[PDB]
């Protein structure tokens, strides 16, 4: 964008101050903030003689 | 894998353009229109839950 | 704003596209949506067979 | 009285000025500073959850 090689960013692209300093961003379309990915702790399982 | 809890922050995606490019306002108007037309949520449904 | 009675709007005046035809909205400070308010459900005696 | 159902659409608020007013750009630049500082949610905590 800042090097003029391509014209528009329809993309999974974060709006941030440290980016809008040099480029423009539109209004954002949806809220999608940070979360922590964990692996699931295996799975629950009923037992034949639980 | 599971997402723990909710959103940690207000981080969000918007459409970006070189600064001062005339694409800005019409793209904004279109993307805003899509929110009231439901197209954005319809796409989100398709791409996460229909699939 | 349109008729010069004020210099800036700072309120829960919701973004709408038709309003931005005559004013400029900034980036949002948070997301929210349309919702319904009713009198809340009560807590009361379970069934006879409970 | 209580909330029922989910929110219908991806909408939000915005600070607004007369069209072309000089305030819009410093306001917008301010918002992206306030967001990473956590002020925007801290105020929400102060005005919903702390009350
Ligand atoms: C915060 Cl901290 C900031 C913003 C929103 C929501 C929150 S939170 N985690 O719910 O309190 S917002 O209203 O969803 N919109 C955002 C925009 C600001 C900026 C552009 C968009 C994303 C960065 N502010
Ligand atoms: N329901 S969602 O997660 O896909 C989602 C997230 C967002 C949407 C719209 C949707 Cl549908 N647009 C909002 C903006 C659009 C317009 C309306 C509010 C703001 C202006 N910001 S957002 O938070 O970036």
Swiss-Prot record, chains A, C:
Palmitoylated. Depalmitoylated upon L-glutamate stimulation. Ubiquitinated by RNF167, leading to its degradation. This is Glutamate receptor 2. Belongs to the glutamate-gated ion channel (TC 1.A.10.1) family. GRIA2 subfamily. Induction: Down-regulated in the pyramidal cell layer of CA1 in the hippocampus by global ischemia. The gene is Gria2. Ionotropic glutamate receptor that functions as a ligand-gated cation channel, gated by L-glutamate and glutamatergic agonists such as alpha-amino-3-hydroxy-5-methyl-4-isoxazolepropionic acid (AMPA), quisqualic acid, and kainic acid. L-glutamate acts as an excitatory neurotransmitter at many synapses in the central nervous system and plays an important role in fast excitatory synaptic transmission. Homotetramer or heterotetramer of pore-forming glutamate receptor subunits. Tetramers may be formed by the dimerization of dimers. May interact with MPP4. Forms a ternary complex with GRIP1 and CSPG4. Interacts with ATAD1 in an ATP-dependent manner. ATAD1-catalyzed ATP hydrolysis disrupts binding to ATAD1 and to GRIP1 and leads to AMPAR complex disassembly. Interacts with GRIP2. Interacts with GRIP1. Interacts with NSF via its C-terminus. Interacts with CACNG2, PICK1 and GRIP2. Interacts with GRIA1 and SYNDIG1. Part of a complex containing GRIA2, NSF and NAPA and/or NAPB. The postsynaptic actions of L-glutamate are mediated by a variety of receptors that are named according to their selective agonists. This receptor binds AMPA (quisqualate) > L-glutamate > kainate. The chain holds residues 488 to 537 of 883 of the full protein. It comes from the Eukaryota. Detected in forebrain. Detected in dendrites of neuronal cells. Expressed in the pyramidal cell layers of CA1 and CA3 and in the granule cell layer of the dentate gyrus. It is found in: Cell membrane; Postsynaptic cell membrane; Postsynaptic density membrane. L-glutamate binds at residues 12, 14, 19. The M4 transmembrane segment mediates tetramerization and is required for cell surface expression.
Swiss-Prot record, chains B, D:
Belongs to the glutamate-gated ion channel (TC 1.A.10.1) family. GRIA2 subfamily. Detected in forebrain. Detected in dendrites of neuronal cells. Expressed in the pyramidal cell layers of CA1 and CA3 and in the granule cell layer of the dentate gyrus. The M4 transmembrane segment mediates tetramerization and is required for cell surface expression. This is Glutamate receptor 2. Palmitoylated. Depalmitoylated upon L-glutamate stimulation. The chain holds residues 741 to 791 of 883 of the full protein. It comes from Rattus norvegicus. The record marks 33 as: Interaction with the cone snail toxin Con-ikot-ikot. Homotetramer or heterotetramer of pore-forming glutamate receptor subunits. Tetramers may be formed by the dimerization of dimers. May interact with MPP4. Forms a ternary complex with GRIP1 and CSPG4. Interacts with ATAD1 in an ATP-dependent manner. ATAD1-catalyzed ATP hydrolysis disrupts binding to ATAD1 and to GRIP1 and leads to AMPAR complex disassembly. Interacts with GRIP2. Interacts with GRIP1. Interacts with NSF via its C-terminus. Interacts with CACNG2, PICK1 and GRIP2. Interacts with GRIA1 and SYNDIG1. Part of a complex containing GRIA2, NSF and NAPA and/or NAPB. Induction: Down-regulated in the pyramidal cell layer of CA1 in the hippocampus by global ischemia. Ionotropic glutamate receptor that functions as a ligand-gated cation channel, gated by L-glutamate and glutamatergic agonists such as alpha-amino-3-hydroxy-5-methyl-4-isoxazolepropionic acid (AMPA), quisqualic acid, and kainic acid. L-glutamate acts as an excitatory neurotransmitter at many synapses in the central nervous system and plays an important role in fast excitatory synaptic transmission. It is found in: Cell membrane; Postsynaptic cell membrane; Postsynaptic density membrane. It comes from the Eukaryota. The postsynaptic actions of L-glutamate are mediated by a variety of receptors that are named according to their selective agonists. This receptor binds AMPA (quisqualate) > L-glutamate > kainate. The gene is Gria2.
């Amino acid at each position: 964008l800042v090097y003029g090689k391509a014209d528009i960013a329809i993309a999974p692209l974060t709006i941030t101050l440290v980016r809008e300093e040099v480029i423009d961003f539109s209004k954002p379309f949806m809220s999608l903030g940070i979360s922590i990915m964990i692996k699931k702790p295996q799975k629950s399982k009923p037992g034949v003689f639980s | 894998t599971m997402k723990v809890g909710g959103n940690l922050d207000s981080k969000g995606y918007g459409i970006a353009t070189p600064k001062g490019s005339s694409l800005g306002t019409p793209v904004n108007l279109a993307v805003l229109k899509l929110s009231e037309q439901g197209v954005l949520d319809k796409l989100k449904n398709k791409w996460w839950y229909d699939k």
